[PDB]
């Protein structure tokens, strides 16, 4: 099948109905961290959450960051917007972080009780109307009802493609974010600016000439 | 059967079916069949090219002398834009060549005039379109193919000889030949250069250097001037 | 019966004659195991090819140097041209390493799995990224002239002449190295000098070769 | 079978079922038939749109060249009063877009399920629905006689054509900083010097 490394052998664990049926599989675990299936499923869930959050974050960075080059939507840099917004704020950052911590912990508790026992949150009466749609969609990591509100799941011929493009774009988002932070350390300027620099000159605007990435030269 | 070397023996794949063959592949290049077809095709193409080019250079030097055929590139003037000439050339010739290539890869597949469906070229081999292309034939295709390949290889020789003679004398080949006739002994590369353990001598190149057209300033190096003797 | 490099002594066990240039020369038994032997076969082939390259390049540049054509001497051409143009050591090195790593790791995993490279895991390709022999990847590209698919006897002869010239080129490149490191000069120049006087322009007078 | 490449190998799934198939897909972007239907639909859409767009960008400038409410350049949009700000205009625009658009989607998804005016229940579009070809009152002039072939064919052909022309408009605008009609007039003045290459090299 499609393997990250042609010629290579498939990891023992990575070739099973579940693995080949999970997503985005190319026999890539040279550290064999998935020789255990429970750990493997747990890590699939972790990777899902990471893909989603990284996609969200990289959008929130690029889009306003790109349009600040445009006239409107003049926005400060992302690694400084913290200072900017806390200046323009109305509440102390302590209380802000505390409340957002509470409200994230609640939802995380729900997700976690589910991943512990899938049919956990359909317990009748535990809420007033939640349990109705508060039940898994037979695939741990794809809640239903309001989640997937536009009925994109009632068309299975697009189901696999949705899953695949989700995981692909998520992995790309994680990678782009790491590039962001790395270049903000090395150069320190706007990502769009590093972009424009390497475009105005590829052959000399690069880590190869940053004098830092490769210090021995 | 004639052989390029009388008294010798031909190779295996070289049989004698192809026109103008003389069992000349001392390196057995004609081993594989598709490669063989490709090479015959390319030989025919080059032969016709060299024939056209040598005839043109000859008659050009005859009719309009004092305009260096090697220098028509710079020395040409046209009211039309050079960009226009190169563009039209590239386009239309790209078309003809890609059509011939489509033919070679899928034989007899495009022999219809795709606008004038009435007009349609009859089927034929490769490198032998015929039809309207051959509307006038005195004699036999057998001898004609032979004469074609003969004159084509000869024209290749003539062209490369013109190139070297122009790189060593910078003259029109006609005047260079007049020179060679004028002096039977001195108008020889032997009289012009030699190599001996003592030292090496090579005659000086005649094309000076990079020549400047309208700003481009083409760099013009000699063909491997280093090993000329 | 094959000409043994040491006329009179019989060849060892693993040295048989199936390969090109089997003059029975492995006095260190480095090729008893067939894995290691096929391995060193591929190694010798690539090295011979590199040496043939290097000798050709050096000799041509050296001729261009002696003739008044401004070509530098090989051991300087690198620095001189990189300073001439607007090149950067880092960018050149990194691009070079990228491309070489790709091609070479592909050859590596081919040697490992002898067939999995023309498996269409490439763009669309097959019947060309599949090996023909250990270190003989003649397909439509590596043998586009297509001699490997004709006259197997002539093909064997070509393997023979290839490995012969490869060994010769290896030796000659090391020649060049010593020539220059000793005479602090140009190789072709040393040649011309020994021509001028072989009796006296030679290592016997170079006063370094023989340290007496 | 008119092929985009005479003598080439057409992939199987392309079968001339839809108006104007030449077997042109060197990337196999429609092997999945649901994708294929989606893409033929969106193709017809974008095509007809580019048609109407090129029409009403060409006509206004060409009439401005001669003998009237305005003669502004095509991409110079925001500059007029129009007795109202663009806000409410684009508002009502998108509302009505929504209605009949949600019904276009209905026609595509559940065929034959939207043919009669729910108000004018008597008024009712015909039953040969063919999602993507309502006709009927959309054919209020006795057409659809010539069977369908040339109609659908020339339709999709001119649609792809207008798509290309629209893109070229964007190109000349962005680069030359001028108007397509003027770029045309210039190349007319001299083709031998009005070339992309001339312009990029000068740039
Ligand atoms: C965990 C994710 C995260 C990361 C990597 C950063 C990273 C950064 N924040 Mg941000 N922040 C993050 C989450 C948050 N920040 C803030 C609120 C702030 C403030 C108020 C400030 C930063 C600042 C900083 C910087 C120093 C630490 C650095 C650019 C400082 C900055 O921008 O300095 C220039 C700064 O002043 N951050 C909030 C809201 C409570 C966050 C919530 O998760
Ligand atoms: C690929 C075929 C080709 C070959 C073999 C030559 C060969 C030559 N051209 Mg020509 N040219 C060729 C194509 C073209 N040339 C030119 C434009 C020029 C110019 C402007 C000049 C040459 C010159 C030359 C010479 C040195 C280079 C040499 C005779 C130079 C010359 O004639 O030096 C004496 C020179 O100045 N060529 C055009 C544009 C129409 C070509 C189009 O295919
Ligand atoms: C997904 C993660 C994410 C996070 C953590 C943040 C975080 C922040 N955003 Mg938001 N933002 C995001 C996505 C995100 N944004 C997205 C997807 C968009 C597009 C709608 C935006 C567009 C946006 C704008 C236009 C602005 C913020 C601003 C802010 C800051 C104040 C709130 C804060 C740093 C404000 C800011 O940075 O002010 C200095 C601000 O003006 N964000
Ligand atoms: C996610 C994709 C991604 C993309 C599109 C780019 C794109 C770019 N990076 Mg790279 N980069 C990335 C990830 C990415 N990077 C990651 C994951 C890392 C961590 C190793 C880096 C670390 C990095 C550094 C340290 C530098 C770049 C730089 C650059 C720019 C010049 C090319 C170069 O040196 O590359 C590499 C170019 C716009 C250069 C730059 O910013 O120049 C101004 C540069 O010096 N990148
Ligand atoms: C091999 C193909 C070839 C090529 C590349 C050219 C190229 C050229 N020819 Mg032509 N020419 C050719 C064949 C070719 N010719 C042939 C076969 C003939 C014989 C009829 C001529 C006869 C010919 C003449 C008589 C003249 C040219 C001229 C020219 C030059 C200006 C047009 C141009 C460099 C003109 C020239 O020399 O301009 C300076 C010119 O007057 N050509
Ligand atoms: C296969 C090995 C090989 C390698 C590693 C090099 C290496 C080099 N060659 Mg090349 N070169 C080679 C063979 C090789 N050459 C051969 C066989 C020839 C003759 C066909 C040449 C002819 C040649 C020339 C004439 C020039 C180079 C140049 C160069 C230098 C810049 C690239 C570099 C030292 C460039 C150089 O040194 O310029 C001064 C250059 O212009 N080479
Ligand atoms: C001058 C000596 C020489 C000779 C006689 C041969 C002979 C051969 N080479 Mg070549 N080859 C040579 C030098 C030589 N090679 C060098 C110096 C290189 C390095 C560029 C190569 C790289 C090379 C490759 C990569 C391949 C051949 C292949 C071949 C075979 C078909 C051509 C044939 C046995 C092809 C082969 O092995 O076909 C089975 C093939 O794939 N050769
Ligand atoms: C590959 C074949 C080869 C060839 C054809 C030559 C040719 C030559 N070598 Mg030798 N040489 C070679 C390999 C070769 N060498 C190798 C492999 C080494 C390493 C031991 C040397 C190391 C070497 C030195 C150190 C010297 C020569 C010298 C010479 C020249 C004079 C003859 C002599 O004293 O020896 C002559 C041009 C001498 C020289 O330069 O004389 C002018 C000289 O001093 N060579
Ligand atoms: C957004 C516009 C759009 C869309 C969605 C489509 C959709 C389609 N085109 Mg394409 N096409 C378009 C614009 C578009 N086209 C334009 C502007 C041109 C002009 C170059 C063409 C010219 C074209 C040809 C010539 C062909 C297609 C074909 C196709 C079909 C298969 C290829 C594919 O995946 O795409 C598919 C229904 C193939 C087909 O079967 O069309 C019916 C085919 O042969 N198209």
From TrEMBL, chain A:
Chlorophyll a 5 binds at residues 42, 50. Chlorophyll a 8 binds at residues 108, 111. Chlorophyll a 22 binds at residue 213. It comes from the Eukaryota. Chlorophyll a 12 binds at residues 144, 166. It is found in: Plastid, Chloroplast thylakoid membrane. Chlorophyll a 1 binds at residues 4, 47, 50, 165-166, 169, 171, 183, 198. Chlorophyll a 19 binds at residues 198, 206. Chlorophyll a 10 binds at residues 144, 166. Gene3D superfamilies: Chlorophyll a/b binding protein domain (1.10.3460.10). Chlorophyll a 21 binds at residue 212. Belongs to the light-harvesting chlorophyll a/b-binding (LHC) protein family. Chlorophyll a 15 binds at residue 169. Chlorophyll a 2 binds at residues 4, 28. Chlorophyll b 4 binds at residues 83, 100. Chlorophyll a 20 binds at residues 207, 210. Chlorophyll a 3 binds at residues 26-28. Chlorophyll b 3 binds at residues 83, 134. Chlorophyll a 11 binds at residues 144, 166. This is Chlorophyll a-b binding protein, chloroplastic. Chlorophyll a 18 binds at residue 198.
From TrEMBL, chain B:
Chlorophyll a 27 binds at residue 195. It holds the Pfam family Chloroa_b-bind. Chlorophyll a 11 binds at residue 94. Chlorophyll a 15 binds at residue 113. It comes from the Eukaryota. One of its GO terms (molecular function) is chlorophyll binding. Chlorophyll a 14 binds at residues 97, 100. All-trans-violaxanthin 2 binds at residues 25, 27, 60, 69. Its main location: plastid. Chlorophyll a 26 binds at residue 195. Disulfide bonds join 205-222. Chlorophyll b 7 binds at residues 99, 113. Chlorophyll b 9 binds at residue 195. Chlorophyll a 10 binds at residues 48, 130, 148. The light-harvesting complex (LHC) functions as a light receptor, it captures and delivers excitation energy to photosystems with which it is closely associated. This is Chlorophyll a-b binding protein, chloroplastic. The gene is LhcI-5.
UniProtKB/TrEMBL annotation, chain C:
Chlorophyll a 4 binds at residues 39, 47. Chlorophyll a 8 binds at residues 104, 107. Chlorophyll a 18 binds at residues 194, 202. Chlorophyll a 1 binds at residues 5, 44, 47, 161-162, 165, 167, 179, 194. Chlorophyll a 3 binds at residues 23-25, 44, 167. Chlorophyll a 20 binds at residue 209. Chlorophyll a 16 binds at residues 183, 203, 206. This is Chlorophyll a-b binding protein, chloroplastic. The keyword Metal-binding does not apply. The lineage of its organism: Eukaryota, Viridiplantae, Chlorophyta, core chlorophytes, Chlorophyceae. It comes from Chlamydomonas reinhardtii. The light-harvesting complex (LHC) functions as a light receptor, it captures and delivers excitation energy to photosystems with which it is closely associated. Chlorophyll a 13 binds at residues 161, 165. It is found in: Plastid, Chloroplast thylakoid membrane.
TrEMBL record, chain D:
GO terms for biological process: photosynthesis, light harvesting in photosystem I; response to light stimulus. Chlorophyll a 25 binds at residue 200. Its main location: plastid. Chlorophyll a 4 binds at residues 38, 46, 160. Chlorophyll a 7 binds at residues 101, 104. The keyword Ligase does not apply. Chlorophyll a 14 binds at residues 135, 155. Chlorophyll a 6 binds at residues 46, 101, 104. Chlorophyll a 2 binds at residues 4, 48. Chlorophyll b 10 binds at residue 117. Chlorophyll a 1 binds at residues 4, 43, 154-155, 158, 172, 187. Chlorophyll a 22 binds at residue 196. It comes from the Eukaryota. Chlorophyll a 11 binds at residues 135, 155. Chlorophyll a 26 binds at residues 200, 203. Chlorophyll a 12 binds at residues 135, 155. Chlorophyll b 6 binds at residue 103. Chlorophyll a 5 binds at residue 46. Chlorophyll b 5 binds at residue 103. Belongs to the light-harvesting chlorophyll a/b-binding (LHC) protein family. This is Chlorophyll a-b binding protein, chloroplastic. It comes from Chlamydomonas reinhardtii (Chlamydomonas smithii). The lineage of its organism: Eukaryota, Viridiplantae, Chlorophyta, core chlorophytes, Chlorophyceae.
């Amino acid at each position: 099948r499609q393997s990250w490394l042609p010629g290579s052998q498939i990891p023992a664990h990575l070739d099973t109905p579940a693995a080949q049926a999970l997503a985005g599989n190319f026999g890539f675990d040279p550290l064999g961290l998935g020789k255990d299936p429970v750990a493997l499923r747990w890590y699939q869930q972790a990777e899902l959450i990471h893909c989603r959050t990284a996609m969200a974050g990289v959008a929130g960075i690029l889009i306003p960051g790109l349009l600040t080059k445009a006239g409107a939507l003049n926005v400060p840099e992302w690694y400084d917007a913290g200072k900017v917004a806390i200046e323009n704020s109305f509440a102390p950052w302590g209380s802000l972080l505390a409340v957002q911590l509470f409200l994230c912990g609640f939802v995380e508790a729900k997700r976690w009780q589910d991943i512990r026992k899938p049919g956990s949150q359909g317990e009748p009466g535990s809420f007033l109307g939640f349990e109705a749609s508060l039940k898994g969609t037979s695939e741990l990591g794809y809640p239903g009802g309001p989640f997937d509100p536009l009925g994109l799941s009632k068309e299975a011929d697009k189901w696999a493609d949705w899953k695949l493009k989700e995981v692909k774009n998520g992995r790309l988002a994680m990678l782009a974010f790491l590039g962001f932070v790395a270049q903000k350390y090395a150069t320190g300027a706007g990502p769009v600016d590093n972009l424009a620099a390497h475009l105005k000159d590829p052959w000399h605007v690069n880590y190869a000439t940053n004098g830092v990435s490769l210090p021995f030269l | 059967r004639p052989l390029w070397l009388p008294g010798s023996t031909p190779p295996a794949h070289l049989k004698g079916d192809l026109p103008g063959d003389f069992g000349f592949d001392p390196l057995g290049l004609g081993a594989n069949a598709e490669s063989l077809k490709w090479f015959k095709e390319s030989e025919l193409v080059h032969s016709r090219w060299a024939m056209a080019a040598v005839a043109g250079i000859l008659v050009q030097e005859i009719v309009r002398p004092d305009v260096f055929w090697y220098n028509a590139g710079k020395e040409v003037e046209s009211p039309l834009g050079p960009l226009g000439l190169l563009a039209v050339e590239f386009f239309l010739m790209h078309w003809v060549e890609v059509r011939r290539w489509q033919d070679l890869r899928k034989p007899g597949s495009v022999d219809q005039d795709p606008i004038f469906s009435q007009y349609k070229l009859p089927p034929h081999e490769v490198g032998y379109p015929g039809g309207v292309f051959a509307p006038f034939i005195p004699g036999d295709l057998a001898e004609l193919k032979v004469k074609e390949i003969k004159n084509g290889r000869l024209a290749m020789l003539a062209f490369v000889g013109f190139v070297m003679a122009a790189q060593v004398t910078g003259k029109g080949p006609i005047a260079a030949l007049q020179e060679h006739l004028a002096d039977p002994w001195g108008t020889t590369i032997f009289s012009k250069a030699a190599v001996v353990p003592g030292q090496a001598v090579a005659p000086p190149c005649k094309i000076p250097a990079s020549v400047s057209y309208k700003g481009i300033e083409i760099p013009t190096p000699c063909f491997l001037q280093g090993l000329w003797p | 019966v094959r000409p043994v490099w040491f006329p009179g002594n019989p060849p060892p066990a693993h040295l048989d004659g199936s390969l090109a240039g089997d003059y029975g020369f492995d006095p260190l038994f480095l090729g008893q195991e067939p894995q290691t032997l096929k391995w060193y076969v591929q190694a010798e082939l690539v090295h011979g090819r590199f040496a043939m390259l290097g000798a050709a390049g050096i000799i041509l540049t050296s001729i261009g140097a002696k003739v008044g054509l401004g070509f530098p001497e090989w051991y300087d051409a690198g620095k001189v041209v990189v300073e001439k143009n607007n090149i950067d050591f880092p960018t050149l090195m990194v691009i070079q390493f990228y491309l070489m790593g790709w091609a070479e790791t592909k050859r590596w995993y081919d040697f490992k799995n002898p067939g999995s490279q023309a498996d269409g895991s490439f763009l669309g390709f097959t019947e060309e990224f599949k090996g023909l022999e250990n270190g003989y990847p003649g397909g439509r590209f590596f043998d586009p002239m297509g001699l490997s698919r004709g006259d197997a006897a002539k093909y064997q002869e070509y393997k023979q002449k290839e490995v012969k010239n490869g060994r010769l080129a290896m030796i000659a490149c090391l020649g060049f190295a010593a020539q220059y490191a000793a005479t602090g000069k140009g190789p072709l120049d040393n040649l011309a000098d020994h021509l001028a006087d072989p009796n006296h322009v030679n290592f016997a007078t170079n006063g370094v070769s023989i340290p007496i | 079978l008119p092929s985009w490449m005479p003598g080439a190998d057409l992939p199987g799934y392309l079968n001339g079922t839809l108006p104007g198939d030449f077997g042109f897909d060197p990337l196999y972007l429609g092997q999945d038939p649901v994708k294929l239907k989606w893409y033929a639909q969106a193709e017809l859409m974008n095509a007809r749109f580019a048609m109407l767009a090129v029409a009403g960008i060409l006509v206004p400038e060409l009439l401005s060249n001669i003998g009237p409410g305005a003669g502004v350049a095509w991409y110079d949009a925001g500059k007029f009063e129009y007795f109202a700000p663009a806000s409410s205009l684009f508002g009502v625009q998108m509302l009505l877009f929504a209605w009949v658009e949600i019904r276009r989607y209905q026609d595509f998804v559940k065929p034959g399920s939207a043919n009669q005016d729910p108000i004018f229940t008597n008024n009712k579009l015909p039953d040969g629905n063919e999602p993507g070809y309502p006709g009927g009152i959309f054919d209020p002039f006795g057409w659809s006689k010539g069977d369908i072939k040339s109609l659908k064919l020339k339709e999709i052909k001119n649609g792809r054509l207008a798509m290309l022309a629209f893109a070229g408009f964007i190109g000349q605008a962005y680069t030359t900083g001028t108007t397509p009609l003027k770029n045309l007039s210039t190349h007319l003045a001299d083709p031998w010097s009005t070339t992309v290459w001339q312009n990029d090299l000068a740039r």
